[PDB]
Amino acid sequence: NLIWEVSNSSYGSITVDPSDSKLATLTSFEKEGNLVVTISTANESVVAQIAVNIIDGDSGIFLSQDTVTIRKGGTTTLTAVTGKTPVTWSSNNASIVSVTPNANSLTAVITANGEGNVTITADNGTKTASCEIVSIPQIDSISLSQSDVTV
Amino acid sequence: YRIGSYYITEEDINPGDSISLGFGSWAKVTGVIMGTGVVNPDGSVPNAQRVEFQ
Amino acid sequence: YRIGSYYITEEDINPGDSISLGFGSWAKVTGVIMGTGVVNPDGSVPNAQRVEFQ
Amino acid sequence: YRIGSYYITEEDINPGDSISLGFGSWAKVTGVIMGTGVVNPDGSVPNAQRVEFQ
Structure with missing residues (x-):
């Protein structure tokens, strides 16, 4: 028979469950990366290898704000929460609204230069989320000192 | 999701007659x-919630 | 901390395959x-914490 | 990348005596x-890739 063991079992509370006759059971915890599952003989120098990998669960890419309402010429920011550090950001109609990923790539600074409705994407890794950024007109209504003037 | 032209549940004698069959709504x-x-x-950027129906 | 130009995690079968390893950002x-x-x-006098990045 | 204060080549008898030792600039x-x-x-827009001069 053979005994299954894993070098430096720390990937879970029970890294390698004891095998009953031939096969055994595995366990997982809050860890990321690959793992080694060696099935070695009791005394003989024969050890099979079984590859395992639990890549940090899911991704759960979700923008901080699903919709944005910025004026023409304004600036904003979107703090995306993604497990992967590299998060590329993009936005169609860059003349209307622009996007720049943060230093950690988690955040994204928005800049609504133009006017009009547009969507800004982010989190290029794996799954990419979306967030609408409406470049509504500033409509900063100015008022003249006088209207009915007599020159 | 199972689609069939016969109005008989999966547990019916005519169907396979195994497991519990439940009607599904939406896609x-x-x-x-x-x-x-x-x-x-x-x-507009749309937000989707996992396991969320709306 | 390990320095390597290859995109291979230290938790691979070749390494010890134990402990929590994550990619680092900045110096x-x-x-x-x-x-x-x-x-x-x-x-301005900055306040720095261990494993703190800002 | 390896950092050391001793001016001994990586392949020298005094050093580990393995691999090729090359000078590294910056952190x-x-x-x-x-x-x-x-x-x-x-x-801003960062840079990536290994060995790439940009």
């Missing part, structure tokens, strides 16, 4: 985030 | 009080 | 950020 869509790449121009 | 700065002697003029 | 930066981006935090 199933894989989890995804709208406008992830900013491909849609001038479109 | 490593040893713990110290910034501007203790007021050497740099016009520099 | 290693974790792949994800490049440093200065935005005055108020917005973030």
Whole structure:
């Protein structure tokens, strides 16, 4: 028979469950990366290898704000929460609204230069989320000192 | 999701007659985030919640 | 901390395959009080925590 | 990237005596950020790749 063991079992509370006759059971915890599952003989120098990998669960890419309402010429920011550090950001109609990923790539600074409705994407890794950024007109209504003037 | 032209449940004698069959409403869509790449121009960013129906 | 130009995690079968390993961002700065002697003029005194990035 | 205060080649008898030793300039930066981006935090466009001169 053979005994299954894993070098430096720390990937879970029970890294390698004891095998009953031939096969055994595995366990997982809050860890990321690959793992080694060696099935070695009791005394003989024969050890099979079984590859395992639990890549940090899911991704759960979700923008901080699903919709944005910025004026023409304004600036904003979107703090995306993604497990992967590299998060590329993009936005169609860059003349209307622009996007720049943060230093950690988690955040994204928005800049609504133009006017009009547009969507800004982010989190290029794996799954990419979306967030609408409406470049509504500033409509900063100015008022003249006088209207009915007599020159 | 199972689609059939016969109005008989999966547990019926005429059908396979195994497991519990329940009616399903709406369609199933894989989890995804709208406008992830900013491909849609001038479109509002949509937010999707996992296991959320709305 | 391990330095490597290859995109291979240290938790692979070749390594020990134990402990939690994650990719790092930015450079490593040893713990110290910034501007203790007021050497740099016009520099605000920063508060730095262990494993803290900001 | 390896950092040491001894002026001994990596292949020398005094050093580990394995691999090729090459001079390294500057400090290693974790792949994800490049440093200065935005005055108020917005973030610039970083650089990536290994060996790439940019």
